[PDB]
Design a binder for this molecule. Structure first.
Ligand SMILES: CC[C@H](C)[C@H](NC(=O)[C@H]1CCCCN1C)C(=O)N(CCCCC(C)C)[C@H](C[C@@H](O)c1nc(C(=O)N[C@@H](Cc2ccc(F)cc2)C[C@H](C)C(=O)O)cs1)C(C)C
Ligand SMILES: Nc1nc2c(ncn2[C@@H]2O[C@H](COP(=O)(O)OP(=O)(O)O)[C@@H](O)[C@H]2O)c(=O)[nH]1
Ligand SMILES: [Mg+2]
Lengths: 428, 68
């Protein structure tokens, strides 16, 4: 047992979090009641990483569902896998947060946060050896961004020596039309730079473009977006959930992926890209998985990898395949494209292979890159932010909850510093 | 230090909301007082002018009786 405590906050957080639990429960042979019905002991060896074990041989997700409104969590409770979660772990208010980071972080979210922490405390005390915490949330809304970062800060105070992991969904004008999302995102990124060890940048711009351009879905839904998020989430946690060699826990992942503390924002990738139902009958070859997982068109952050250099990379292949052929293909990628891998971190690409593929596929590959190209994502937020902030536009929604402009200036500064920091290492 | 700042923000929000209620209440009190005394002053002058007509109307009737 090296236990991870999962928290999901706000609409987006609870929606992609719900889907994560559906996917990994199916991969571990857990059904909606928490009963094991699998045909392989590999499924149970490291089940305690994500599931508590109750009497009756029942597995309960180590999952805390947080929100400031009840709508999304009634949707989760009423859903197919909803009966799996511990009922006292649903912690919710009635107010909502109005897509306002100040309300989530300082006023509405303050009132609820100590009852979330009581559930986190209970789950933590029950762990033989807690690794740390993983949070799912968006950065563009109110609850997930504002209250979610408040939670990160409180958890860090109680558990300063555990790993803090996030799946942070970045806002795009292709998906949302709320004008203040760059404000909420910039404030939330300021928090993530200081208080997380590892952040997966799931960018809605990338998710939309993949669905539109590549998957040929002319009117994508959130479900279409989330199907790519859950695949990625299944993929990047494989090393934590099955035996057992490379990046097998959160701290070991961090020591491999994070050469400087502030530069802990990752650019995930996935192959093959699929839409729901629409069937992959043809399995990919090892050469195609390797070409596709490094392709710009397969990144979940809308950044051009050729515009930066890779500091560190984790590649994780799933299914029954030739380990020899994986090794050849991985070496081939870094030898043919050697100038995109910083010379000053030797052997910065590490490779894992898990024998069990995901649902509906024989072969998959998941890419996790710490590239300096991720500055393009932050730079996009910064430009959207500065356009409004130079005229103090929409700032009354934030100052009316007691914030000062100085908080905005500091957050603007820290993110622009992050950008220049990435450019520093891109030119060394 | 971050926990003390979170506290300060929520107190600022409460204080500005309370100051807004206060000023609305003071500004409305001084407006209504100012209006009442202004309107009483306008009616007082109206009737004090009508009472000067009654003093003049008796001077006219007494001036008649001083032609006897
Ligand atoms: C007529 C508005 C449509 C709905 C909207 N278009 C826009 O916002 C355009 C218009 C103008 C300028 C550019 N913007 C982006 C749109 O297509 N949206 C997002 C905005 C919804 C916000 C308000 C109107 C509710 C898409 C998502 C939208 O179609 C929805 N999907 C779902 C959805 O996924 N529902 C699932 C359940 C679910 C509910 C809520 C969730 F948050 C997630 C999943 C069930 C379905 C059957 C499924 O799995 O496909 C609910 S609403 C984005 C991908 C662009
Ligand atoms: N990919 C994805 N994005 C979402 C989903 N729901 C909301 N968002 C995005 O999240 C942002 C708003 O945050 P939301 O989670 O709804 O607000 P909260 O309830 O206050 O945390 C917008 O940029 C939305 O496009 C979802 O189910 N999937
Ligand atoms: Mg919402």
């Amino acid at each position: 047992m090296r236990e991870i405590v999962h928290i999901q906050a706000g609409q987006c957080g609870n929606q992609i979090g719900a889907k994560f639990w559906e996917v990994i429960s199916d991969e571990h042979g857990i059904d909606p009641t928490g009963s094991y019905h699998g045909d392989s002991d590999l499924q149970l060896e490291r089940i305690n990483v994500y599931y508590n074990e109750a009497t009756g041989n029942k597995y309960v997700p180590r999952a805390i569902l947080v929100d400031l409104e009840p709508g999304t969590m009634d949707s989760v409770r009423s859903g197919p896998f909803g009966q799996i979660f511990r009922p006292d772990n649903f912690v919710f208010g009635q107010s909502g947060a109005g897509n306002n980071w100040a309300k989530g972080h300082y006023t509405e979210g303050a009132e609820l946060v100590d009852s979330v922490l009581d559930v986190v405390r209970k789950e933590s005390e029950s762990c033989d050896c807690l690794q740390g915490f993983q949070l799912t949330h968006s950065l563009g809304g109110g609850t997930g961004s504002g209250m979610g970062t408040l939670l990160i800060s409180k958890i860090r105070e109680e558990y300063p020596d555990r790993i803090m992991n996030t799946f942070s969904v970045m806002p795009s004008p292709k998906v949302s039309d709320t004008v203040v999302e760059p404000y909420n995102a910039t404030l939330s990124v300021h928090q993530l730079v200081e208080n997380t060890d590892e952040t997966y940048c799931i960018d809605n711009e990338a998710l939309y473009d993949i669905c539109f351009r590549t998957l040929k879905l002319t009117t994508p839904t959130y479900g279409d977006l989330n199907h790519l998020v859950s695949a990625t989430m299944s993929g990047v946690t494989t090393c934590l959930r099955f035996p057992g060699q490379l990046n097998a826990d959160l701290r070991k992942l961090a020591v491999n992926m994070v050469p400087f503390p502030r530069l802990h924002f990752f650019m995930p990738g996935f192959a093959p890209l699929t839409s729901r139902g629409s069937q992959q009958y043809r399995a990919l070859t090892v050469p195609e998985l390797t070409q596709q997982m490094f392709d710009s068109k397969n990144m979940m952050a809308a950044c051009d990898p050729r515009h930066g250099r890779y500091l560190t990379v984790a590649a994780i292949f799933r299914g029954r395949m030739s380990m020899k052929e994986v090794d050849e293909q991985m070496l081939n990628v870094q030898n043919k494209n050697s100038s995109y891998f910083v010379e000053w971190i030797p052997n910065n690409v590490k490779t894992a292979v898990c024998d069990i593929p995901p649902r509906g596929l024989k072969m998959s590959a998941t890419f996790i890159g710490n590239s300096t190209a991720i500055q393009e994502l932050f730079k996009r937020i910064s430009e959207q932010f500065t356009a409004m902030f130079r005229r103090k536009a929409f700032l009354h929604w934030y100052t009316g909850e007691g914030m000062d402009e100085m908080e905005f200036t500091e957050a603007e500064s820290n993110m622009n510093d992050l950008v220049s920091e990435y450019q520093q290492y891109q030119d060394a | 230090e971050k926990r003390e700042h979170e506290r300060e923000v929520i107190q600022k929000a409460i204080e500005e909301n309370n100051n807004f209620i206060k000023m609305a209440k003071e500004k409305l009190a001084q407006k209504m007082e100012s209006n009442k005394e202004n309107r009483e002053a306008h009616l007082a002058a109206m009737l004090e002018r009508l009472q000067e007509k009654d003093k003049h109307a008796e001077e006219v009737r007494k001036n008649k009786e001083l032609k006897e």
